[PDB]
Design a protein around this ligand. Structure first.
Ligand SMILES: [Ca+2]
Ligand SMILES: [Ca+2]
Ligand SMILES: [Ca+2]
Ligand SMILES: [Ca+2]
Ligand SMILES: [Zn+2]
Length: 533
């Protein structure tokens, strides 16, 4: 029943292995995020070697049907390498990894390694991940080829089999930083052939395994970087087959686009005659057009007329509330011709992930993106890009519609020059004002981050960056800092904006560093009255 993490903080391998098998894989999970005290005790080189030896002989005896103990043991072993990476106090001696490779081989060579089934899939998942976590990607290319060859609809029925076998592609990805692997990968013609066939299996399209086919396509495209190798004609032959068999937009385009993403990074699009696919993709994927007004155009993938209307109506609303709150006088900053805005809305975050990168040139591991372009250019039309979501705001249900729209208004009326122009950090303001103008006082997560005990000073908020993408600090605490100033010192907000509206970034920074000294006490008390009321 209950996890007892202290049992793992021990010098006895027997007590350690008793804790693994008796607490099971779900308690061993705690070791990933445990204190450096527990990690250092549990993941000594002695423990790893002894656990690996016992794991090797239990795996030799495996007779199918799954194993909670093996699952927990290989989970432990791969947790050690995780801790070895993140914990400086932890470095494995040279004789550990050969023993871990002994434990993995024992499972690989067991007659049941390629068994089908959900319980088996659970252990298999941990073994395949360990191949990656232990830097052994060079040792199992023939295992990858076997799994790619043997996969079929019967394996596909089990979630844990899909999840486990998908780990071969993470292994091919991880091999890039494995000098044995990159020394070997150029001769693996059988593996390349099996990757081609796996991705080209049309029965995976629109199935629960399509995502595996897309991963196979991606990993294949990475192999185009070995331009001289024995595998190079077959890699090229495989990529050509994928691009010609699947559409860039339609059923299976995740496979097409998966290949395109990596193949373009390591070779040129002209080899496969796919240069400039993004334009036809933009027209096919964003095939609806709705003209809100002469200043806002929507291009969308699949929205209803009612969503279009509610989106137009909501943006017109935010515009007038923005201009009143920011005291713009409707006067844009200088050298900004961004009178017209183009709004691009995909059907879902999945579609955004597939399509927005190529069409717009952006990262898509986020909730949306605003692209100001160059306001000084006559004919510049900025774009924000977003996706429909069930949890978005009715009646449009476009995730971050109001948020991105305020980015456009902020960029045109508060922030001189294009996006990269400032020479000081403006993240707290840009994101804070985008949240505050669009949510005003409805922000439960902002209240929550006050009540949970972890807080930020004004000084820390102003020095916030996108590094690590700390959503709490960026969006919640940016929101609080902005809201606090508009409520308690809106006249100081205008003094700041006099600077930002003229590009005077050093004066802007001197102004808000003054705030971080004057108003910290007032801000601290204010966040408390917010968490109380
Ligand atoms: Ca380390
Ligand atoms: Ca829709
Ligand atoms: Ca601007
Ligand atoms: Ca917090
Ligand atoms: Zn934003």
């Amino acid at each position: 029943e209950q996890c007892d993490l202290s049992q793992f903080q021990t010098t006895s391998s027997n007590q350690l292995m008793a804790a693994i098998r008796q607490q099971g894989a779900s308690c061993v999970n705690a070791l990933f995020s445990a204190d450096t005290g527990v990690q250092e005790a549990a993941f000594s080189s002695n423990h790893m070697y002894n656990v690996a030896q016992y794991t090797r002989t239990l795996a030799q005896q495996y007779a199918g049907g799954g194993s909670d103990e093996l699952e927990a043991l290989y989970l432990y072993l791969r947790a050690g390498y995780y801790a070895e990476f993140y914990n400086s106090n932890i470095t494995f001696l040279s004789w550990v990894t050969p023993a871990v490779k002994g434990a993995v081989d024992a499972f690989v060579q067991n007659a049941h390694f390629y068994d089908n089934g959900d319980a088996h899939g659970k252990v298999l998942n941990e073994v395949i991940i360990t191949m990656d976590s232990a830097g052994l990607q060079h040792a199992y290319l023939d295992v990858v080829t076997q799994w790619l060859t043997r996969w079929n609809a019967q394996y596909a029925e089990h979630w844990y089999m899909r999840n486990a076998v998908n780990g071969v592609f993470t292994l091919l990805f991880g091999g890039q930083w494995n000098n044995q692997y990159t020394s070997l990968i150029g001769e693996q013609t059988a593996l390349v052939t099996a990757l081609q066939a796996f991705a080209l299996d049309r029965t995976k399209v629109n199935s629960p395994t399509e995502f595996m086919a897309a991963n196979a396509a991606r990993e294949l495209g990475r192999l185009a970087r070995y331009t001289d190798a024995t595998i190079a004609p077959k890699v090229t032959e495989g990529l050509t087959a994928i691009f010609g068999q699947y559409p860039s937009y339609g059923d299976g385009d995740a496979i097409w686009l998966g290949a395109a993403d990596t193949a373009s990074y390591y070779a040129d699009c002209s080899q496969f005659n796919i240069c400039g696919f993004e334009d036809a993709l933009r027209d096919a994927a964003l095939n609806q057009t709705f003209i809100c007004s002469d200043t806002i155009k929507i291009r969308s993938q699949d929205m209803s007329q009612a969503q279009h209307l509610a989106a137009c109506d909501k943006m017109a609303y935010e515009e007038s509330f923005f201009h009143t709150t920011l005291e713009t006088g409707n006067q844009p900053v200088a050298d900004d011709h961004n009178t017209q805005l183009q709004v691009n809305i995909f059907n879902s975050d999945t579609d955004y992930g597939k399509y927005a990168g190529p069409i717009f040139g952006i990262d898509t591991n986020n909730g949306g993106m605003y692209l100001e372009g160059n306001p000084a250019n006559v004919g510049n039309i900025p774009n924000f890009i977003a996706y429909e979501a069930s949890y978005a705001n009715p009646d449009h249900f476009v995730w971050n519609l109001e948020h991105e729209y305020v980015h456009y208004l902020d960029g045109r009326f508060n922030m001189y020059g294009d996006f990269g122009t400032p020479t000081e950090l403006v993240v707290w303001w840009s994101e804070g004002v985008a949240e505050y103008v669009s949510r005003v006082n409805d922000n439960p997560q902002a209240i929550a981050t006050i009540q949970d005990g972890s807080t930020y000073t004004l000084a820390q908020v102003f020095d916030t960056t996108y590094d690590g993408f700390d959503v709490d600090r960026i969006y919640r605490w940016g929101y609080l800092a902005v809201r606090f100033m508009f409520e308690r010192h809106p006249d100081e907000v205008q003094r700041m904006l006099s600077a930002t509206r003229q590009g005077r970034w050093a004066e802007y920074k001197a102004i808000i560093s003054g705030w971080a000294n004057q108003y910290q006490s007032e801000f601290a008390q204010w966040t408390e009255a917010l968490a109380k009321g």
